[PDB]
């Protein structure tokens, strides 16, 4: 369970980082829209985001249903992951609606930071 929890923490950090990448790409395009190629630019970016989300869920779902961390369940985690995929696609369009993007970015950040912080506490105890 030590290794399971450590691996989950690492995958949580990786997914948080992806979420940040989405937001920074979006903001950059919002400042100055860059052209992109579906195969050279978008697909690889979206694929890496999907890898991050799937890797996280592989461990996070069994964890959430066995450890029953406070105020957190499966749907919340799946939605946090859905957001990362949506924002990865929308990030290539700087005209994506700002509040919707922000709300998706922040929701994921909130949920995953809660997971990270919980696991770091469990680690350091």
Q: How far apart are the first and last CA of the chain?
A: 14
Residues in the chain: 125
What contacts 54, CB < 8 A, 6 or more positions away? Answer: none
What technique determined this structure?
X-ray
Cα angle 63-66-68, degrees, rounded to a multiple of 5:
90
Rounded Cα gap, residues 101 and 97, in angstroms: 6
Of the candidates 108, 116, 59, 112, the one whose C-alpha atom is nearest the C-alpha of residue 86 is 108
Of the candidates 123, 124, 125, the one whose C-alpha atom is nearest the C-alpha of residue 5 is 123
Q: How many CA atoms lie within 13 A of 19 on its CB side?
A: 27
Domain extents in the chain: 1-125
User: What fold characterizes domain 1-125?
Assistant: 1.20.120
Q: How many CA atoms lie within 13 A of 28 on its CB side?
A: 10
């Amino acid at each position: 369970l030590y290794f399971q929890g450590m691996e989950l923490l690492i995958r949580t950090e990786q997914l948080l980082l992806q979420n940040e990448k989405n937001w920074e790409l979006y903001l950059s395009n919002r400042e100055e829209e860059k052209p992109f190629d579906f195969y050279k630019d978008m697909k690889p970016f979206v694929d890496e985001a999907k890898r991050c989300a799937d890797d996280f869920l592989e461990l996070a779902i069994p964890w959430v249903n066995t450890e029953r961390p406070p105020y957190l369940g499966e749907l919340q985690l799946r939605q946090a992951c859905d957001n990362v995929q949506m924002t990865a696609v929308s990030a290539f369009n700087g005209r994506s609606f700002y509040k919707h993007f922000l709300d998706h970015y922040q929701s994921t950040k909130y949920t995953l930071t809660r997971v990270r912080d919980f696991l770091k506490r469990k680690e350091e105890s």
